[PDB]
Amino acid sequence: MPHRTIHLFRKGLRLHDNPTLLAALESSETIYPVYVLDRRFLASAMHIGALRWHFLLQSLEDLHKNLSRLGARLLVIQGEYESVLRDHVQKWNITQVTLDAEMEPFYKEMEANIRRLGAELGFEVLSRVGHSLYDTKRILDLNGGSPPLTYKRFLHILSQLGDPEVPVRNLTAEDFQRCMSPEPGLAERYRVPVPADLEIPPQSLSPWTGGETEGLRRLEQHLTDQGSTTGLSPYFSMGCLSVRTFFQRLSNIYAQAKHHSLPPVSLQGQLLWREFFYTVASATQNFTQMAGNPICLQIHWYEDAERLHKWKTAQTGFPWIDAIMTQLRQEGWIHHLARHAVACFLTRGDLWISWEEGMKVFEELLLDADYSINAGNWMWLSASAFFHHYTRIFCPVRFGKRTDPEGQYIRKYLPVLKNFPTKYIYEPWTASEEEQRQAGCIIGRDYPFPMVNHKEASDRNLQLMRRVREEQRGTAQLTR
Ligand SMILES: Cc1cc2nc3c(=O)[nH]c(=O)nc-3n(C[C@H](O)[C@H](O)[C@H](O)COP(=O)(O)OP(=O)(O)OC[C@H]3O[C@@H](n4cnc5c(N)ncnc54)[C@H](O)[C@@H]3O)c2cc1C
Incomplete structure (x- = not known):
């Protein structure tokens, strides 16, 4: 050879x-x-x-x-x-x-x-x-040359196409005996750099550790625990784990269960969502921006770098929002619905800041940052494409209350608030100044006032989004 x-x-x-x-x-x-x-x-x-x-x-x-x-x-x-x-x-x-x-x-x-x-x-x-489950071109061809713009249509095309591509075999020591990997001269030049070579703090504090080995371990530990989600997204985005290998493993479980276990099939659906956005992104011009993007609603978002700065630095004054952005910054990963909460808050819900700016922050901070998935979901959460129930806006106070009424998540990531009674943990600005003194946290000094009034901001933004959708009917219809 x-x-x-x-x-x-x-x-x-x-x-x-x-x-x-x-x-x-x-x-x-x-x-x-x-x-x-x-x-x-x-x-x-x-x-x-x-x-x-x-x-x-x-x-x-x-x-x-x-x-x-x-x-x-x-x-x-x-x-x-x-x-x-x-x-x-x-x-x-x-x-x-x-x-x-x-x-x-x-x-x-x-x-x-x-x-x-x-x-x-x-x-x-x-x-x-x-990087994909399918030959993307085959999906495009079956749909007449253009990417399916709804998940329903995507699934319809996949049902004509069939199963995903299968993984190829593992590499062996014999492969590197037939095809030798020589040690180059001056081999110290080719070592993996250490953090100080990249001017970053030496200790990594994320509960995530990179690499194929940890990815495979986590994958198998999740399936054993199933006998919260997989937490595998950083490994898929970096390529430490093959989506084809994981898809087939889930099919193996479905088969051994005699087709009686649907949870593995549900998890296969998560990878089909990934494939959906990869497919759109691969065949749509200017996919990761608004201007010139043929499927994206054109919205005159505010240029307000200070609003973006407060959101990015977890200083919005809404503990639920700031707690999520804190976990993102300190750990590099947050739950799917936590991403919904903060992306809606930044864009259509409250701040009226471009989804492109939220995308760029997520790109910097997410271990699993993925060109296609991040752009697609940011257009979704800003109701710029794909999602159309724009009168539904996450409440930055009430949403966490249903999940975590005592605010344990808030107290973990925002310890300045740890002594607030639960009656105020989601809205600490409603405490009297004397209750603030007793909790050791004066609002406006130790933790900020809320940066908007949610009721007034979301009302504002609903009227703005309604004008957009009443005028750009054809664009919105593309992804409905
Ligand atoms: C605003 C916003 C930005 C996002 N940016 C990213 C990003 O940069 N990278 C990223 O991998 N995911 C992104 N997501 C999707 C989602 O939140 C993560 O994929 C998921 O939280 C990762 O956790 P998990 O591996 O436990 O997911 P699981 O539920 O275990 O899903 C398994 C895998 O399926 C894929 N997947 C799951 N949900 C989605 C989805 N909605 N869209 C596409 N693929 C999906 C991922 O590869 C994931 O690892 C974003 C979502 C939103 C709302």
């Missing part, structure tokens, strides 16, 4: 169900498994917070360990990807570069530039899809 190959990890930080890396190994006599850490590229394409950096480095550490157990290695190269390739195609006499066929525009542009470099330097480029 002739090729000397670089495989470029970008997502796909796993060895199970990795069709591109498998294709690389089957076609090559020597291989260099590489992650290019390109700060200039990421600076131009992404917003990445400290917790996300920690999860990436942990996932790279684990990938290095798993490759090393098979007689190989991970090579982390720090630089601009074009210069890195010019240098290392020469150093390693490369004839093939492999990389996953990611759908993100910034990844597609990188891929286009790498293909152009291959035409110049003399390497072929091979890609396989490792």
Whole structure:
């Protein structure tokens, strides 16, 4: 097998169900498994917070360990990807570069530039899809060339298409005996960087740890506990876990239960929601912004950086909202309906700030930040597309009360409020100043007053949204 190959990890930080890396190994006599850490590229394409950096480095550490157990290695190269390739195609006499066929525009542009470099330097480029359950193009073709714009229509097209693609086999020590992974000269240059190399605090405090190994453990620990959700989203978004592998595992449980257990089928539905947004995002221009986006309602959101700042820094004065944003910032993950609460509050519900700004904050702070899922759900929660019950607005006081009447979640993440009686824990501004003194927390000093009046703001915003939907009837109809 002739090729000397670089495989470029970008997502796909796993060895199970990795069709591109498998294709690389089957076609090559020597291989260099590489992650290019390109700060200039990421600076131009992404917003990445400290917790996300920690999860990436942990996932790279684990990938290095798993490759090393098979007689190989991970090579982390720090630089601009074009210069890195010019240098290392020469150093390693490369004839093939492999990389996953990611759908993100910034990844597609990188891929286009790498293909152009291959035409110049003399390497072929091979890609396989490792991020989706289905061949997205097949879904588009069955729907006449355009993506389904409702989940119902999406499911109808999938029922014509059939089952998802199956995972490919695991990689083995024999693969790296047939296709050798040489230790390069100057190998200390290729170590996984440590947090201080990225100027981030050294200790990661997220209850999440990156990597394929922890992803697989968590997956199996969830199914055993089932005998709160999976908490697997960061592993799917980073590629530490294959959605095809998880889909098939759920099918295995359904089969062994003689088709009598529907909970695994419900969880398969969560991955179909992921696939829905990936499919729309892959075939919709300007998907992650409002202007020029053909399915997005055009809404003149306020430019009010101070409102955004208060929301982002958990200083809205609504404890339920600030507690969620605090868990997001400190841990990097929040429950689906917690995301509903704060996204509705920021956009159509209260602050009337663009969903694009909420998306960018979530991108920075979420371990599971995902181009397609995040944009799709932010359009949903702002009632810009997909969701149309705009007279229904989450109450930033009452919603948590049903869940957690005593406010234990609030007291955990906002300990300044920990001594407030539950009668005030969701609306501490209604306490008298003397009750505030007794709780040790003066509103406006230790914890802010509420930044809007929810009743007045949501009333305002309902009238604004109604004008939008009465005028842009055709746009709203696209996703209903
Ligand atoms: C405003 C907003 C922004 C969001 N941004 C993201 C994001 O950047 N990345 C992300 O992975 N999810 C995002 N979500 C979706 C959802 O909240 C998370 O997928 C889920 O909370 C992750 O927890 P889990 O793995 O326990 O989910 P589970 O319920 O265990 O679901 C299993 C998997 O299915 C997928 N999934 C579940 N719900 C959805 C959904 N509504 N849409 C798409 N895929 C779904 C995820 O890959 C998830 O890991 C967003 C939701 C909202 C409302």
